[PDB]
Amino acid sequence: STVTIEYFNQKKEMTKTLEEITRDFEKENPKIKVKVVNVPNAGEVLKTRVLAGDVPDVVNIYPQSIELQEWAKAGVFEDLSNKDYLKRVKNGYAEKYAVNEKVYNVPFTANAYGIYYNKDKFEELGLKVPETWDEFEQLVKDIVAKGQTPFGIAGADAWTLNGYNQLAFATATGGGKEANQYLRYSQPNAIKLSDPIMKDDIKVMDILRINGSKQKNWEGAGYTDVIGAFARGDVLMTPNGSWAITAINEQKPNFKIGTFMIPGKEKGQSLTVGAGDLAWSISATTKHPKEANAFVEYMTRPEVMQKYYDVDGSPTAIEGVKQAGEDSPLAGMTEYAFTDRHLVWLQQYWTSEADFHTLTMNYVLTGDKQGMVNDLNAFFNPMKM
Numbered sequence: 163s164t165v166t167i168e169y170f171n172q173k174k175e176m177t178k179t180l181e182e183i184t185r186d187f188e189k190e191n192p193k194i195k196v197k198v199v200n201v202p203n204a205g206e207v208l209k210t211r212v213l214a215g216d217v218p219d220v221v222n223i224y225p226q227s228i229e230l231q232e233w234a235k236a237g238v239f240e241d242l243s244n245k246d247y248l249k250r251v252k253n254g255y256a257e258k259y260a261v262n263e264k265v266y267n268v269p270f271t272a273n274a275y276g277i278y279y280n281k282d283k284f285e286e287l288g289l290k291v292p293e294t295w296d297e298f299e300q301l302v303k304d305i306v307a308k309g310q311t312p313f314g315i316a317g318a319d320a321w322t323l324n325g326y327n328q329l330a331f332a333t334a335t336g337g338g339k340e341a342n343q344y345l346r347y348s349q350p351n352a353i354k355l356s357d358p359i360m361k362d363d364i365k366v367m368d369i370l371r372i373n374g375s376k377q378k379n380w381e382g383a384g385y386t387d388v389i390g391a392f393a394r395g396d397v398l399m400t401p402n403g404s405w406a407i408t409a410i411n412e413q414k415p416n417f418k419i420g421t422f423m424i425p426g427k428e429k430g431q432s433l434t435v436g437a438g439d440l441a442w443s444i445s446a447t448t449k450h451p452k453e454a455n456a457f458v459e460y461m462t463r464p465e466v467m468q469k470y471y472d473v474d475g476s477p478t479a480i481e482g483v484k485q486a487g488e489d490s491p492l493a494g495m496t497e498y499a500f501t502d503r504h505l506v507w508l509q510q511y512w513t514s515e516a517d518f519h520t521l522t523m524n525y526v527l528t529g530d531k532q533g534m535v536n537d538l539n540a541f542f543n544p545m546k547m
C-alpha cells in the first residue's frame with residue numbers, strides 16, 4: 163500500500179538536484195513515491211491537464227501567472243493559508259500572491275533578471291559595470307573595438323529576453339505599475355512610435371543591435387548554446403535570469419562571474435524583475451492529500467532547502483537558509499531582492515506572454531520599429547476590452 167504522487171516540475175536547470183532531494187524524501191517516507199515529471203512545453207501540457215481535470219498532485223507553477231490566478235479562483239489548488247510549514251516562508255511572500263486573501267502557492271525562491279558578465283575579462287579590458295543606458299551603449303561599443311564579442315543572444319529562444327524588454331519599459335517609465343499603465347491599461351492603439359516612452363524602449367533594445375554586438379550565428383542559437391558560449395569566454399555578457407547560474411556553473415568556467423542590473427536613464431535608476439521561482443501549489447483534487455503536504459513540508463525544512471539553494475543560488479524566502487556573501491555570482495542582480503526595486507513580472511495583468519517574447523526577439527533580429535510598435539498594439543488590444 164505504497165502511494166505514488168506526481169510533482170510537475172517546470173524547473174529544468176535544477177532537475178538533477180530536485181531528483182536527489184526527492185530520493186532523500188522517499189528514503190525517509192518509505193510508504194511514499196514521487197514521480198518527477200519534466201516534459202517539453204510544460205506551460206501548455208499543464209494547461210491541457212488542468213482543463214481535463216488531471217492535475218498533477220504537486221505542481222511547480224509560477225505564482226504571478228494568470229493561470230495560477232484563474233485556477234486558484236476556480237478551486238483547482240488547495241488553500242494553504244492555514245498550514246504550519248507556511249510560517250517558514252518569510253517576507254510575507256506567500257501573501258504577495260494571495261488570491262481573495264487566500265494563499266495557494268508556496269513560493270520557496272524568487273528569481274531576478276540582469277546581465278551576467280565575465281569579471282576577469284572586464285578587469286583585463288579596463289571596463290566597468292554600467293549605470294546609465296548611455297554608459298551601457300558605450301560599454302558594448304568599447305568591447306567591440308577591443309576585438310571581443312559583447313553579447314551571447316539565444317535567437318531561437320525568445321523568452322530569454324522577456325525580462326530585458328520588460329525592464330526596458332520598466333526603467334523607462336519609473337517601475338512596473340507605470341509600464342503597464344503605458345502598455346496595458348491605456349487606450350486601444352495608444353502605443354505610438356513617437357511617444358518618448360517608446361523612444362527609450364527602443365534606445366534600450368537598440369543596445370542589443372549595436373554593430374558587432376552578438377556572437378557568430380546567434381539567430382539560431384538556443385539557451386544552452388549561449389550558456390556554453392558565456393561559460394567559455396566566447397562572449398563577455400549574456401542577459402538572462404538568476405535561473406541560468408546553475409547551468410553556467412555546470413560548464414565549469416575559468417573566470418569569476420558577475421552580474422548587474424539593467425540601468426536607467428540616470429545613475430540609481432536600475433531595476434530587476436521576477437517572481438516566485440521554485441514555487442509549488444497542491445491539487446485540490448489529489449487522491450493523496452496528506453502525502454502532498456508532506457512533500458511540500460519537506461521542501462521548507464531549512465536543511466533541505468540549503469541543499470537546493472547551494473546548487474541553484476536564486477535568492478530564497480525560507481527561514482534558516484544561509485545566504486551567500488556579496489562575492490557571489492548573483493550578488494548584483496539580487497542585491498535588491500524583495501525591495502520595491504524587484505518588480506513582479508509585468509504579465510501578471512496580461513492574458514499571455516508568448517507574443518511579447520516574439521516581438522522582442524523579432525526586433526533584435528530585424529530592427530523594425532514601426533513593425534514592433536504595430537506588434538505591441540496587436541498583442542495588447544484584445545486585452546483592453
Ligand SMILES: OC[C@H]1O[C@H](OC[C@H]2O[C@H](O[C@]3(CO)O[C@H](CO)[C@@H](O)[C@@H]3O)[C@H](O)[C@@H](O)[C@@H]2O)[C@H](O)[C@@H](O)[C@H]1O
Pocket residue numbers: 172173174175203204205224227273321322324325403405437439440507509515
Ligand atoms: O523569463 C520568462 C519567464 O520567466 C518566469 O519563469 C521562470 C522560469 O523561467 C524559465 O523557464 C521556462 C523555460 O522556457 O520558461 C517557461 C515559462 O514562461 C517555462 O514553461 C519553462 O520552464 C527557466 O527555465 C526556469 O528555470 C524558471 O523557473 C515566469 O514565471 C514566466 O512566466 C516567464 O515570464
Ligand SMILES: [Cl-]
Pocket residue numbers: 205514515516
Ligand atoms: Cl503564454
